[PDB]
Structure 1
Amino acid sequence: TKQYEKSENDLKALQSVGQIVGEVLKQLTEEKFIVKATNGPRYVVGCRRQLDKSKLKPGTRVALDMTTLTIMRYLPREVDPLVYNMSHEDPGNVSYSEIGGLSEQIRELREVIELPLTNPELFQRVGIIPPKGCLLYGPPGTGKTLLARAVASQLDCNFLKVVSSSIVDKYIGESARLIREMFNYARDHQPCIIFMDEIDAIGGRRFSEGTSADREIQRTLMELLNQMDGFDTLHRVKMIMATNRPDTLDPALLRPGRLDRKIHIDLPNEQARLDILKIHAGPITKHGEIDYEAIVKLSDGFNGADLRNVCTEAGMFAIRADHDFVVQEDFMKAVRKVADSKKLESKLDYKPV
């Protein structure tokens, strides 16, 4: 029962008041150390006898006391968006080769990513600069989020994710230090891979500057433009971006450097649609008599999200008939009808609104 006495004595040590944290700036002398608290005041204070030479550091966060503001222990500094960035997930592996097309985009994205990791020798011996970035835009077909994130999730602890909602951040919020942090940790984990999706809102041009909120978009831009075209070495880390249209990217992003390789997604083709139907027919049960050319021919110019989810819509029409294994006749009904209904809903392609 002495564990209670042990537990309460540990809570007696909890009577010790907590301290405050700050960032070291410089040092005037041994008895005065410039430290900037997270609030922004800067103090020059002494120190106690329990610390070492590793406490000083070149501008690293420290914990200031609440009385004399002296430093107790030092800890590594992070603003910690990254743990939130690593909270993503995705199956595959397999989903790499499941899309089926285009075969040239399947093989190339495997090279520019994996080859610099395993074989740097080809770059240094031939004397060529490997691509440090890439651009995958849409939606002329699917595979943007599927193929890129598959290698991401398979690369495990080495990856960086960016959602377009985190750039605006909060009122009078600072995303300029996020752009510098995103590329700072990109230079830590190697090779790092960064995904930026739906940049049309956060890629704001400075031609027409609305209200007070367009400039803070330009600030996040110029922070991206500086480090991607640096002057700061990104050669080992790979970057990826995504957008609906490259209208607002400006000559800065449309240029090479910051955006290196722009690979346009291609819609599924009758030859390639035969492969994507094989992977769709796996999870769904079918009748013993099935023809893959029937579904491929009846559905043309449809994205992979259209084909899959309508093939599940065919299963929802199949459960309307309660049959477990269903012939493709009931499928071709639900596949053609529901898909042709989707075509009269959204205008594009080809006509803009």
Structure 2
Amino acid sequence: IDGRLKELREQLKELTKQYEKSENDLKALQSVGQIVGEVLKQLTEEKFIVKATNGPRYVVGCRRQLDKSKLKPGTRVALDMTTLTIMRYLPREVDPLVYNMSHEDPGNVSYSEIGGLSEQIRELREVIELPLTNPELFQRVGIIPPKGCLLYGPPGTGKTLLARAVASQLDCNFLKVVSSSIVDKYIGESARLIREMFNYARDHQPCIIFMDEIDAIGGRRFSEATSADREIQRTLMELLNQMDGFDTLHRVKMIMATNRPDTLDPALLRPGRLDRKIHIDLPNEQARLDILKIHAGPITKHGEIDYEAIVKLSDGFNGADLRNVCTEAGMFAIRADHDFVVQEDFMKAVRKVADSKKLES
């Protein structure tokens, strides 16, 4: 029966008819479009002064459907290419296009991709979101919303991963700003850079500023007390006095992801300061096995769910290291060109990373 291939022929006809309607819209337009100008002067109700962006200005008429309230002075409009009459008015935009927001609200199910310390994630959200969601109540009753929170665990669970994930309930744009990048020169005029980044946060009003490293290597090397003396602290005091940056009006918070909270200028933990600090350390056994599970989530092989034995050998390993553990397990499978990953591969990966960090420390 040739009639049973009707369905396939219908699919072919629909597939091409989409292309045919596309081409019909492509050729039926065949338009020259309109030249773009600005309303240099309205002059009167009939004649208007429209200046092209590159020289000549003309005394032209207006579009019949449009009205003077829609045209207005000093607004971008479109003139007819030949007859030189107003055809449509268009909004304009300007862009600084430099050092702008890089990371935005779109994000993965990080809320589920974090795994460890879900209670800690909930606590940080509880501190942050409510002033971020409805700051108008704080002005309405006369209380100052918090500025942000502190995070410990220098190499441990992802502080940046938390800064991403927590914004899920926030629908905000996390920004990854470095303390060295924001201070630049060692002058008090480093407040110029914070003004630019805060203005960027003011343009993208739902924004959380995630700081990279303020107590530069809190575990060793030079702390706030050593090397640059008070330069970091004064620049932080600049963001401190920014707290009057219309906290009622602006949906901007600042998360301080330091390595170690040891040398943090305790003058910056008073009320009105950064205030809140949430404790993050190396993941416990429960958090470690949970993050091992989510790391193994994308991996679908034979293996086993023997996560506790892996935890026993890999205890006190940071989440990034455990992500490296899963990648090393995949590397071991592929260096051996096997499409199977077994618990022995996990044992080899854990032993490799443990020996590597043991030698490096």
TM-score range for the pair, normalised by the shorter chain length: 0.5 to 0.7
Contact 1:205 1:249 in 2 (8 A): no
Give the TM-score, by structure 2 length. Answer: 0.61
Q: Distance in 2 between matches of 1:23 and 1:129?
A: 44
Q: Distance in 2 between matches of 1:214 and 1:60?
A: 51
In the other structure, the counterpart of 1:114 is 129
The structural deviation recorded for 1:148 is 0.4
Q: Distance in 2 between matches of 1:116 and 1:66?
A: 52
For 2:274, which of 259, 273, 289 is the aligned residue? 259
Moved more, 21-30 or 335-344: 21-30
The structural deviation recorded for 1:304 is 0.6
Moved more, 195-204 or 73-82: 73-82
Alignment length, in residue pairs? 346
Q: The residue matched to 1:108 in structure 2 has which SS?
A: helix
CA spacing shift, 1:15–1:246, aligned 2, 3 Å: farther
Moved more, 266-275 or 78-87: 78-87
Q: The residue matched to 2:348 in structure 1 has which SS?
A: helix
Contact 2:41 2:74 in 1 (8 A): yes
Contact 1:85 1:160 in 2 (8 A): no
Contact 2:129 2:170 in 1 (8 A): no
Q: Distance in 1 between matches of 2:188 and 2:40?
A: 23
Contact 1:140 1:264 in 2 (8 A): no
In the other structure, the counterpart of 1:157 is 172
Contact 2:105 2:174 in 1 (8 A): no
Q: Which runs of 5+ in 2 are unaligned?
A: 1-15
The structural deviation recorded for 1:240 is 0.9
Contact 1:161 1:195 in 2 (8 A): yes
Q: Which runs of 5+ in 1 are unaligned?
A: 347-353
Q: The residue matched to 1:112 in structure 2 has which SS?
A: helix
Contact 1:48 1:70 in 2 (8 A): yes
The structural deviation recorded for 1:61 is 19
Q: The residue matched to 1:23 in structure 2 has which SS?
A: strand
The structural deviation recorded for 1:277 is 1.8
The structural deviation recorded for 1:248 is 4.1
**Among the aligned pairs, what percent are the same residue?**
100
More helix by share: 2
Q: The residue matched to 1:22 in structure 2 has which SS?
A: strand
Contact 1:85 1:162 in 2 (8 A): no
Q: Distance in 2 between matches of 1:39 and 1:206?
A: 58
Contact 1:142 1:305 in 2 (8 A): yes
- Over the aligned positions, Cα root-mean-square deviation in angstroms equals 8.5
Q: Distance in 1 between matches of 2:99 and 2:247?
A: 25
CA spacing shift, 1:202–1:82, aligned 2, 3 Å: farther
Q: Distance in 2 between matches of 1:28 and 1:219?
A: 55
Give the TM-score, by structure 1 length. Answer: 0.62
Query: For each residue in 1:131-178, what CA deviation from the matched residue of structure 2 results, as whole angstroms up to 9, or x when unmatched?
Result: 232112331621201010234588667444422342243598942222
In the other structure, the counterpart of 2:293 is 278
Contact 2:151 2:256 in 1 (8 A): yes
Does 1:329 find its partner at 2:344?
yes
